[PDB]
Design a protein around this nucleic acid. Structure first.
Ligand code: SAM
Length: 243
DNA sequence: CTTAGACTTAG
DNA sequence: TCTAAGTCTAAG
């Protein structure tokens, strides 16, 4: 199983097998919430349409794809013991927030993801990244994962946009996999959760299969009632809209 | 998760 | 615009 190079909230690593078991065959895989890209990195579609509302994430992905060798060499320099301290971290954070250069920002973004607290990505209303120092003994430099990503990215387009716009990119040859922000246990509003479900319904009647994962709650069962539900116990829910 | 600082609003 | 409750927000 190919691991992602970012430490990202909600890694689909433990559930890959269950996702891949219910993911229909197609020419193209569309992911409105690509995040770290676990499913992308562990499937074999001829092409991918990958999207996310986080512009730093999408920008990072475009650069890793287009300037791999240059990026890896520059990012590797930041993963030395000399950078594993608060003062250095907070300066790199300030450099990130003040940089107007996508490359340098992409470089620093990997550093902050790995050295900051628990791989969080938080912004203030001014758009400034304000995650505190993570206090790790030895952050890991995901070189092997970076190279694998760029290689696999040659068949992927990246778009910064909301789920409604990326799902509209789907066609008869497409399969849609949705990994929305988690529903509440018994940000991403309840309206948007429900709205996502009705878009899936719209796609399944245009003969476009859609797979959605989320927590297994009373709310998710209601939003996804038009779909064939599958429960994964450890509890996760897979909602399959198949023509 | 937690605390601090600040702004908005009812009374 | 008093005063304090109410709400929002930033960041370790
Ligand atoms: C990582 S997936 C969900 C993983 C897991 N379910 C969790 O919440 O921990 C969430 C991703 O969707 C993206 N996202 C949030 N809102 C979005 C929206 N309205 N449209 C498209 N992408 C969005 C975020 O950037 C985030 O990276």
């Amino acid at each position: 199983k190919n691991r992602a190079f970012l430490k990202w909230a909600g890694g689909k690593y433990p559930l890959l097998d269950d996702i891949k078991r219910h993911l229909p065959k197609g020419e193209c895989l569309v992911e409105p919430f690509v995040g770290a890209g676990s499913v992308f990195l562990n499937t074999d579609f001829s092409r991918y349409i990958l999207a996310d509302i986080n512009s730093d994430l999408i920008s990072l992905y475009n650069i890793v794809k287009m300037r791999t060798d240059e990026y890896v060499q520059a990012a590797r320099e930041l993963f030395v013991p000399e950078t594993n301290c608060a003062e250095v971290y907070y300066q790199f954070r300030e450099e990130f927030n003040k940089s107007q250069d996508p490359f340098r920002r992409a470089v620093l973004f990997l550093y902050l993801n790995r050295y900051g607290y628990n791989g969080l990505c938080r912004y203030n209303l001014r758009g400034e990244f304000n995650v505190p120092f993570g206090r790790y003994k030895k952050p890991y430099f995901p070189e092997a994962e970076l190279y694998h990503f760029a290689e696999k990215a040659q068949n992927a387009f990246f778009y910064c946009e909301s789920y409604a716009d990326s799902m509209a990119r789907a066609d008869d040859s497409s399969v849609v996999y949705c990994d929305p922000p988690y529903a509440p246990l018994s940000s991403f509003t309840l309206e948007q959760q429900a709205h996502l479900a009705e878009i899936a319904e719209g796609l399944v009647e245009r003969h476009i299969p859609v797979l959605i994962s989320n927590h297994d709650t009373m709310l998710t069962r209601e939003w996804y009632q038009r779909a064939k539900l599958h429960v994964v116990k450890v509890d996760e829910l897979l909602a399959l809209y198949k023509p």
